[PDB]
Amino acid sequence: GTSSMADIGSTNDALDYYLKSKGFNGLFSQIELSFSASNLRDRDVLSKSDPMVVVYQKEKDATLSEVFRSEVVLNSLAPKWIKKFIVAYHFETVQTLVFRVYDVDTKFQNSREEMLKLDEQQFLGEATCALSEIITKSTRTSTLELKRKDGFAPQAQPHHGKLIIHAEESLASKISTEIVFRCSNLESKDLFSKSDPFLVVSKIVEHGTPIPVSKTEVRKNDLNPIWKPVFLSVQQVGSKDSPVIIECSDFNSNGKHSLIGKVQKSLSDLEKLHLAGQGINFSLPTGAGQNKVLKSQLFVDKFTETVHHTFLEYLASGFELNFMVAIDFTASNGNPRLPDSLHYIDPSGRLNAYQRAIMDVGEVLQFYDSDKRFPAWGFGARPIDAPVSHCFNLNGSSSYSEVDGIQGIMTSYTSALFNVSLAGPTLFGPVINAAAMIASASLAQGSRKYYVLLIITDGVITDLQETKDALVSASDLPLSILIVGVGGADFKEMEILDADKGERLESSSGRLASRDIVQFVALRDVQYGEISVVQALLAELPSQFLTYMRIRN
Template sequence: MKLQLSLYARKLPNVAGAFKGTSDPFAVVTKIVVEGGGQPKVLGKTEVIKNTLNPDWVKTFTFDYELGTPVKCAVQIFDEVRKGDNKSMGSAVFEIGELLGAKGNTKAKKMKKSGTIFARVEKYRGQGTLRLGMKGVKLKNREGFMKKSDPFFELLRKVNGPSGTMWDAVYRSKHVPNNLSPVWGEATIDLGVLCNGDQSQPILVRVYDHEGDGKHDLMGEFETSVDGLVRAKGGRALIIKRKGKDSGQIFVTRADVAGVENLTERAAAMSVSGGSNAPSTANAPSAAAAFVPGAVAGAAAATGAAAATGAFVPSSVPPSAPTAFVPGAVAGAAATGAYAHSSAPPPVASGKPTFFDYVSGGCQLNLSIAIDFTGSNGDPRRPGTLHYMNPDGSLNDYEKAITAVEGILSKYDYDQKYPVYGFGAKYGGVVRHCFQVGPSSEVDGINGIIQAYRGVFRTGLIMSGPTVFEEVIHTVAARAHSAQESAKQKGEQAYSILLILTDGAVTDVHRTAATINQVSNAPLSIVIIGVGNADFSAMQFLDDAHQPGSHDIAQFVQFNRHSHNSQSLTAATLDEIPDQLTGFFTRHGIMPLAAKRMAEEEIPVGVEEEVDLSLDFGSDGEIAVGSGGYYAPSARW
């Protein structure tokens, strides 16, 4: 997907020097890369804003992004010095995945000296360009006696804010000195930036009197659209108003749209709530049981099945529904339910919602993890076996895979609480194909996952076999359906991902494929990572075995093919999830929720991340990376 990055800053340090006024800040954005992962690249610089420590830059930066491939951008702010070297005002690094997963797709970083940089990402909707020329006539003077205003104009687009709609500046012209009938230079403006490609979308034109101290005086404004500007070309005047009174006229001398095929046809956006097209809960599966090590027998009768087992039991599931198996808990938690296909008709919607649209609207990604504890993994006390816990704290391959995938998906999960399951081990002489790993039904963050995994070997577990996924798949499919239903009741959206880690092929690949097809209408993606050196050729069958009428929700990846690089693993592992997520929601007529802009005081402020990066400013205006621009991959890999 293609994204665009916008920036602003607050309370920057004034580095202009004594008796030299206020700094003139601009920002340079550089895409930095992991060591050995290519060359860092300068994406560009913002415009310079004179005499301010609180700049709102209108320049945006576009780049490509894929889920699973970390992208970091360094933002360096400078005070422009016309005769000499630009002065650094501070810097910060933003991880694009974190911006995507943040509320409002916005985050802030406090810089070391002082000041805060705010960064926001949006989907870039390349829909052609607008070539615009305008002039003012008899604008009302905002200066005093014997002086005339220095007019410039801004174009603002409408966005959703925390308290409703708000206007966001996306273009700013140069000012025309001492002139009440200014003719501004023609500009070429990206329609994706100006109006998300929708030429009927409202835009605001504001005219200001330029002031040297940066506190520009509003001369007047009017609301229109790209279509409105095109219709006004060469014709009637557009009246600007200030405080409800006429304050001048604007004439459109040029308004030409290029790069759009059907200029006169506009697709009507259809608003679809979950409504009658949402998946029905009537045939949803009962939550299958995951055995919970260490649970007290008989606790279910006292506190309820969910409390006794730590298993997730959605409110729509009757109390008798099987729950996650807990060693020592009441027996009889082995049954699984079928996840029925929804009978909802396919949606009729215009446009093609994307993964970005859903996560921007707040769709939460819920990760569940299932780990293979069959005997073929080897004795975990012996070095070289797959579950071996190295005394030096280094990660085994199971832990590496979990850490890499969680590191990406955690950015889209606000609470970062994860259910962890195991399969293929005996408790009390009975082979359990779905048991709870850890002391509770959900653990906190990556540290909670690793601690739960390492602690399971102290619960009386006996590694056994065979390798069976079906019970885990049914359990998580039921959980996924319940999570989305619960989210819908709150006006939200949720999608689940099951990460299965195994050291070998499943015992019955055809039965497993049938189970995946059976749950393929759930809001769920299944990612299977093969760990170790076994023959995984049969596992590829699961990736390709969806039947007519079902949907492809499974992906198989062999760890050893990507063990050299965590980014390679996550890119391969998460490659299909965006299309699977959008496929589920659009099949059921569930459109993305509206993205909302956060109020400035609500945006979480992080700490500056050090980056070794120096830039060379050429005399021709070009900026290049002088040195640095790399970051080290996670030390835990």
């Protein structure tokens, strides 16, 4: 193809970076819950029973859907249920589950569990927790006390047994396939010139364009290329027996790449080829409907299914995510005592935009920290008698920023609101350096903490440059940053910071960001807790965490 060494070098650099960011992209995680119980009792007597556990998904409106039902264990004082509950793990949401244990009537000893009516059985007890509560325990086991509504009695409330829940990440959901592709005698469509080839693997759609799933670097002047390994998860392809498209293409710096050849094979087919050591011939499309077999061949030099080191694997090795907050206290918000202030504290208890953001993020992240000691800052306000502070402790102390839990953040926030003067201008630099300073200390002390700083703002920043510089410096530290914009301001200048919408950050000194650590979204505050545009922001955090873990040195 037609291109300089520099064009090739740079397209490859762009690809390396994108691969580090996506990661071993596309393992959606599944968790196996297994169940046992002890001391099951309707009243004060422990006797043989026929226990069954039923699991409900609790919605935000408190509605319950049945999602699982164990087999009935017969004649038992301590059931160990055989059937496991496989549930999808979504890091970005709190997954509330309700567990109900029943003693099945003996007249249904020979029944399938699916056919049992719960009203016809003896309800023993109920317990509730989040999925994230179980997977973050060091033993991955939770013991929950079964309770009933007896009337009313928080203290004198009898126990009806213990439910023991063990969680394990399913092995199948951790697998990715490493493939080294090789080609033989490639012919570029451009005559009298050697090919500059790359591969693209695509998942097939019916009657519309196939979705790029994987891509190799470009090799310069290679008729018989051996590419670096590409990685593919089962979700990226569909199944191991689903055919994918593999296209060999000639790289042109003008961005219009010519097809060298194409094959259609399943991941299973590729494994067979690899073990046999056999090549397959490429094809080009010819006359609307027919293909032409080429001399050129595709080989599979390596094909290895590996258990990837997943987010859940790191949690199990004692890594934590530690939430941080930084709140805009500039005058642009309006005086907190005004009903139309973005910081208005409604007497009825309704949460303002800042409070909604804190809860939407913190309600999820709280489960990943054992200490629950969250640094909390304000910026752009004048404390009593002092000059404007661009990083002050919400808790009002001079020596430490940490507060106790989400509640601690919420109370420090309302407390700060009526103890400072909203000022100006808007700066992110100082708070980012404060978070960086903590992350850096954690790194040097060989701690296993990864920080997530939520910055909430209602306007554009003044110190765009020193912000970029601070983000770049921070990109080597165990820190992710979420930026939420509240109110109706125009946040166009914010998007240059976003991982998705923006571009790789460059320092003023010329240095580039090791990885993307920043996401921005505008809370377009019409939302009552429905679409929850924050969720998407949380979804990217495990990737960022894993990227940090791969890069770090």
